[PDB]
Amino acid sequence: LRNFCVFSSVKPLDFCDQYSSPCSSDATVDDGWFVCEYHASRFFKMEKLALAIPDGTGNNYYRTVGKSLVDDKAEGIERILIPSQNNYETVLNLSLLGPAERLVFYMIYDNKEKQNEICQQLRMYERFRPEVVEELYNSTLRVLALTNPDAYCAQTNTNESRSFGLSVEDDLAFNVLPTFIQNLIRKCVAPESLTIGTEDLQLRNCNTCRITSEGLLASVRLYNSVQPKYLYGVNENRLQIRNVLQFQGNANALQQKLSRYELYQINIPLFLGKQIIST
């Protein structure tokens, strides 16, 4: 597939796709997220990070992890990274989104009546472009089937096991998430303790997120101040005012002489659960 992004087929009527930041080449490769960096940052409010695991030789067991983009000052529906069926309409703000985005999200969450009424309202557009709708639906449905744990092929790797907490509520809630949402969640949060073969590698002793009935949240108020490089960039006649935290400083307080050491950026990777890798 040249485009593994689910939101790759998101087009207006006369489509020079919105893409203020063009979709990254990550959609071309099969890393398993099935979403490009731009769509991940815009919708799920997370970026992609290459988790490197050294072993003392030079080669690193590379992995994909989610990088939080929400700030510690946030509260409410803004702190949720990935919503569940309960309130995803309000979280993703599907009311004013483009009809292709609405369709894609609704049939990812699989609520029949919503895409039914989308088709009813899209019938008027259908007389101009009667071919894009079917191919868009086919591509998105086949992507969902590929990421679906149960299908015809149903490619299953029981050797990898993911635990999202020692409590019953956490995994019982995680069970009812959509198949694509489950696949994205399992492969965006790094394990707390990667159990590989007959040993355990303690990647992190603290969780940077939480899985609950409404989905994946940045529950901990870890301080984050990274700016998204693939911002929406649309002309904002609708103003969103925010409480920015800024400090002053001189050349002495801004210690440039400390810059020679390799930098340890304050990023917020998603760490939760245990990864059981037999053998």
* Of the residues 196, 212, 274, 276, which one makes contact with a copy of itself according to CB under 8 A: 196
- β-pair partners for 211: 216
| Smallest separation (angstroms) from a copy of itself to the CB of 267 | 7
Q: How far apart are alpha carbons 153 and 146 in whole angstroms?
A: 9
**Between residues 144 and 190, which has the closer beta carbon with respect to a copy of itself?**
190
Question: Dihedral of the CA atoms 135, 137, 139, 144 (nearest 10)?
Answer: -170
| Smallest separation (angstroms) from a copy of itself to the CB of 152 | 18
| Smallest separation (angstroms) from a copy of itself to the CB of 178 | 25
Q: For tokens 């203020």, what's the residue? A: 20
**Between residues 168 and 244, which has the closer beta carbon with respect to a copy of itself?**
244
Q: Which amino acid type is present at position 139?
A: S
Contacts to a copy of itself from residues 63-92, by CB under 8 A:
63-65, 67, 72
* Of the residues 39, 42, 48, 102, which one makes contact with a copy of itself according to CB under 8 A: 48
Contacts to a copy of itself from residues 114-173, by CB under 8 A:
159
243 binds a copy of itself (CB under 8 A): yes
- Confirm if 79 and 214 have CB atoms less than 8 A apart: no
Q: Which amino acid type is present at position 176?
A: V
| Smallest separation (angstroms) from a copy of itself to the CB of 166 | 17
DSSP 252: T
State the number of CA atoms in the 13 A half-sphere of 177 facing the CB.
Answer: 26
Q: How far apart are alpha carbons 55 and 68 in whole angstroms?
A: 26
93 binds a copy of itself (CB under 8 A): no
**Between residues 120 and 205, which has the closer beta carbon with respect to a copy of itself?**
205
Q: How far apart are alpha carbons 218 and 211 in whole angstroms?
A: 9
276 binds a copy of itself (CB under 8 A): no
| Smallest separation (angstroms) from a copy of itself to the CB of 247 | 4
Distances (CA, A) of 223 to 72, 73, 155, 186, 192: 5, 8, 39, 24, 19
246 binds a copy of itself (CB under 8 A): yes
Interface with a copy of itself: number of residues (CB under 8 A)? 76
201 binds a copy of itself (CB under 8 A): yes
